Design a protein around this ligand. Structure first.
Ligand SMILES: Nc1ncnc2c1ncn2[C@@H]1O[C@H](COP(=O)(O)OP(=O)(O)O)[C@@H](O)[C@H]1O
Lengths: 48, 447
């Protein structure tokens, strides 16, 4: 599938990708922070 | 990319019946061998299965049951199971039989306070309130001088209104030191006032000030709302006998004085009964009779036993659970007369008795395993078998009591779990009630 789409797009569909050109920028430090819900949230979530 | 978690609030303390979660009966009314934290005692658990229906029926008053059986058999564990089985909303009132000896009020009356506390009531109260920033405040004077009105202008995010109010409310606003620019709340049914602070609009007017500031109230200046209030008959009885509602000097000063208990008279309870029946008739109220649990019943005085003859024959009184662990003792207050469980025959004829009985070695092992995993500790099988033997030699209470001490030794010498050698060490540091009673009998010349 992929190769067909690539060849169809190539004559009209420029790309860059940040890491080729934004060489002077810092990379995004990306955090996922898990949180624990409260007593009031437990009561309602359970009732649902 | 990076992942993080936070939670540091210390979890709830473990205690002597925190493993019990309910009776663990099946739908047919029979008892499962092990469920919801209980094991064994099938006839007594089946009997408690009848009593949780007797409570939820709402039909009855003054029915009473006695849990009886040797120390360490699980009487109060069952009564605590029933308190789980009824759920939170039915009032369950725990009491010990030595609490009747107050220094403020007669024993005969302390019982009545507890009975009236075990009947709950649920009320759909409607409150009407005014709230806003006070933009204007003006009294209107009249002749024999008097105050006829106060005029108050209030402001909220919706707009403004202006109200004419009784001098009682002006007296209250003065007392609360209210001024223009303050945000206030008034409930018109009670006549009560609360100051919240100055409106946020003014919060930058000074470099240095003592006040807290609040955002402008949302919604209409005047509104009425329903609050579902849970209460007991006792709470109505007492709040009328030494009042603190309203806003007069007398009630306001009665909030400062030392709160002595008092013998509420039969005329007040009579008038409160009529009021709550009229709240039920209007469909404003629902009644929820609950349970009174009187542990260690064997040491009420004979004056108190002879009062329960009358209180259990009331058409109002809630369902009562007594508990006792005594043989043919002398009845307190009589000095001469002995009877089963320490209770007079005349009262013992007005109760149904539930027999509770000693555990087998297999049951003790099972309870110890349940309890160890409740206290959060890991135990090896040969250790647990050793504790089982200690149980048969002593008492299951002592056998359970060694668990946490053993776990401390285990972590001190770097083991994750109780090994047999830990239990075998702890058993020699702490004596039990029989082994200590031996050494103290041998050396009886010296104590
Ligand atoms: N059947 C049972 N299942 C589980 N735990 C039990 C059982 N019976 C008693 N226990 C527990 O054993 C201990 C002794 O029971 P308890 O209710 O204190 O006995 P008592 O009848 O002397 O008041 C308590 O920790 C209690 O929770």
């Amino acid at each position: 599938q992929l190769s067909r789409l690539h060849m169809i797009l190539k004559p009209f569909m420029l790309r860059r990708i940040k890491k080729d050109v934004e060489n002077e920028l810092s990379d995004k430090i990306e955090i996922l922070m898990y949180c624990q819900l409260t007593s009031r949230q437990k009561l309602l979530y359970q009732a649902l | 990319k990076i992942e993080e978690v936070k939670s540091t609030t210390k979890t709830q303390r473990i205690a002597s019946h925190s493993h019990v979660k309910g009776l663990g009966l099946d739908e047919s009314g029979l008892a499962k061998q092990a469920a919801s934290g209980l094991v064994g005692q099938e006839n007594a658990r089946e009997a408690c299965g009848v009593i949780v229906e007797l409570i939820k029926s709402k039909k009855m008053a003054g029915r009473a049951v006695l849990l009886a059986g040797p120390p360490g058999t699980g009487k109060t564990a069952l009564a605590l199971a029933i308190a789980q089985e009824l759920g939170s909303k039915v009032p369950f009132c725990p009491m010990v039989g030595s609490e009747v000896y107050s220094t403020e009020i007669k024993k005969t009356e302390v019982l009545m306070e507890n009975f009236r506390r075990a009947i709950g009531l649920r009320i759909k109260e409607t409150k009407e309130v005014y709230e806003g920033e006070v933009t204007e405040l003006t009294p209107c004077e009249t002749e024999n001088k008097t105050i006829s009105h106060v005029i108050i202008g209030l402001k909220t995010a919706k707009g403004t209104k202006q109200l004419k109010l009784d001098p009682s409310i002006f007296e209250s606003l003065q007392k609360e030191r209210v001024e223009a620019g303050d945000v206030i709340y008034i409930e018109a049914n009670s006549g009560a006032v609360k100051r919240q602070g100055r409106c946020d609009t003014y919060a930058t007017e000074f470099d240095l000030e003592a006040e807290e500031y609040v955002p402008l109230p949302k919604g209409d200046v005047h509104k009425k709302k329903e609050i579902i209030q849970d209460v007991t008959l006792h709470d109505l009885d007492v709040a009328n006998a030494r009042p603190q509602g309203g806003q007069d000097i007398l009630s306001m000063m009665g909030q400062l004085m030392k709160p002595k208990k008092t013998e509420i008279t039969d005329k007040l309870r009579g008038e409160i009964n009529k009021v709550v029946n009229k709240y039920i008739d209007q469909g404003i109220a629902e009644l929820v009779p609950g349970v009174l649990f009187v542990d260690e019943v064997h040491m009420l005085d004979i004056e108190c036993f002879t009062y329960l003859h009358r209180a259990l024959e009331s058409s109002i009184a809630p369902i009562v659970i007594f508990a006792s662990n005594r043989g043919n003792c002398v009845i307190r207050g009589t000095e001469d007369i002995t009877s089963p469980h320490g209770i007079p025959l005349d009262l013992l004829d007005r109760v149904m008795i539930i027999r509770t009985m000693l555990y087998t070695p297999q049951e003790m092992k099972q309870i110890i395993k349940i309890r160890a995993q409740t206290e959060g500790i890991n135990i090896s099988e040969e250790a647990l078998n050793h504790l089982g033997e200690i149980g048969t030699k002593t008492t299951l209470r002592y056998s359970v009591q060694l668990l946490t001490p053993a776990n401390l030794l285990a972590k001190i010498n770097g083991k994750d779990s109780i090994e047999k050698e830990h239990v075998e060490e702890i058993s020699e540091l702490f004596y039990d009630a029989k082994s200590s009673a031996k050494i103290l009998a041998d050396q009886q010349d010296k104590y």
